[PDB]
């Protein structure tokens, strides 16, 4: 009965491996599908997974945020960052995942933090042109990140994350991006590693239209899953690589 | 006009240094006071800081949670963990700090993770008897923590965190406790260090009575502070030691 809007994004939402046509919600698998099953089991509801038409997360509105605003979806279950501008138009459950910006670089170097990159110019580094990561640096008033923005600002920016990862693999370049993706990539490419910890902090939350009768029910369920260790189990399940 | 309940806890809420009697809200200083000033400035409200009588956070209810439940306080601004049982009786803003259980141990050893402690018995380790940390281990079904509970369960538990810290300093003992305290202690005692990362995940939120007209206003303000980098600035301000 509940319409869930989401977006194809590895390993949150992916098509089950198969060479034949797949039907229904079961054609999808991933972290967010497992989370949805857990939520539906706790709250006791049926659901219909729909892919947001424009394939966008939500900016101003479009994407999943718009689907919720227009009430075409009851929930948005995806790695949707809880932000100031979004929280004003939709509601978010408490975070089912906490993350932040971090660094993707090749293993085997003495570089161990953002500071190490900030105090040199041999190694180039940047982020996806005009993304929230680039904006973070442009607006930061913190010493380390101001220096980094000055460097980035002075060809160090990339078209998208995929190109950024290739840049890291084919040149002496460090990429700044969402940490969850960095963990996913490093678990699959032993030549790459995360440099330092989280540069900023944010979380992913399940989205609902403002005033939804499921808002608090979902937060409670998430806290239950968090405390039972199920969110940790799910993260490990979909992120762990072959070592 | 707004009554804020809180609790003396270094460095969240402390008495300003002085040898003469201090009056009003200004007799207090700390991370939570700075957060309160920021919130009051954004939402535009006046406040009266009161110390919760029983000096408890909130368990079943007593402490700050009870003050909110009985509507004797409009807000609870303190390092109050957002939990399943508490969220059912009061409301929490989105987290202004994210943390978890971690390890406090002496520097200079090859121990680098919970796994390292779990696979040995020479070094004793434990937590505060009957606390949420001990309960975490007792209920965990994760290999590493089950092994640790078996060890702890088989004098490794302490009366309180202070005794635990002394145990770490005077004997070959590792203490499991809230990471925020570990960061505070290690910043002040160069002989101690945090072992590994976070074992579980949780956050601190501002508490309000269920159905408060400030609930969403505070979450929005927190996201604003988070995105502007003010929460990071405040954390650094009150946690940084003399190196
Ligand atoms: C979900 C995934 C981890 C793949 C992700 O990686 N980078 C992102 O955004 C960067 P920007 O804000 O620059 O578009 C997002 C999406 C983001 N969590 C959102 O809610 O829009
Ligand atoms: C605030 C501080 C960081 C000092 C803290 O350190 N250990 C704690 O609890 C351990 P237990 O749950 O075992 O009492 C708390 C208090 C906790 N955040 C709460 O909300 O009760």
Swiss-Prot record, chains A, B:
<feature type="topological domain" description="Extracellular">
    <location>
        <begin position="110"/>
        <end position="243"/>
    </location>
</feature>
<comment type="function">
    <text>Ionotropic glutamate receptor that functions as a cation-permeable ligand-gated ion channel, gated by L-glutamate and the glutamatergic agonist kainic acid. L-glutamate acts as an excitatory neurotransmitter at many synapses in the central nervous system. Binding of the excitatory neurotransmitter L-glutamate induces a conformation change, leading to the opening of the cation channel, and thereby converts the chemical signal to an electrical impulse. The receptor then desensitizes rapidly and enters a transient inactive state, characterized by the presence of bound agonist.</text>
</comment>
<feature type="glycosylation site" description="N-linked (GlcNAc...) asparagine">
    <location>
        <position position="191"/>
    </location>
</feature>
<feature type="binding site">
    <location>
        <position position="79"/>
    </location>
    <ligand>
        <name>L-glutamate</name>
    </ligand>
</feature>
<feature type="modified residue" description="Phosphothreonine; by PKC">
    <location>
        <position position="186"/>
    </location>
</feature>
<feature type="binding site">
    <location>
        <position position="178"/>
    </location>
    <ligand>
        <name>L-glutamate</name>
    </ligand>
</feature>
<feature type="binding site">
    <location>
        <position position="132"/>
    </location>
    <ligand>
        <name>L-glutamate</name>
    </ligand>
</feature>
<feature type="modified residue" description="Phosphoserine; by PKC">
    <location>
        <position position="153"/>
    </location>
</feature>
<protein>
    <recommendedName>
        <fullName>Glutamate receptor ionotropic, kainate 1</fullName>
    </recommendedName>
</protein>
<comment type="subunit">
    <text>Homotetramer or heterotetramer of pore-forming glutamate receptor subunits. Tetramers may be formed by the dimerization of dimers. Can form functional heteromeric receptors with GRIK4 and GRIK5. Interacts with KLHL17.</text>
</comment>
<feature type="binding site">
    <location>
        <position position="133"/>
    </location>
    <ligand>
        <name>L-glutamate</name>
    </ligand>
</feature>
<feature type="binding site">
    <location>
        <position position="86"/>
    </location>
    <ligand>
        <name>L-glutamate</name>
    </ligand>
</feature>
<feature type="binding site">
    <location>
        <position position="81"/>
    </location>
    <ligand>
        <name>L-glutamate</name>
    </ligand>
</feature>
<comment type="similarity">
    <text>Belongs to the glutamate-gated ion channel (TC 1.A.10.1) family. GRIK1 subfamily.</text>
</comment>
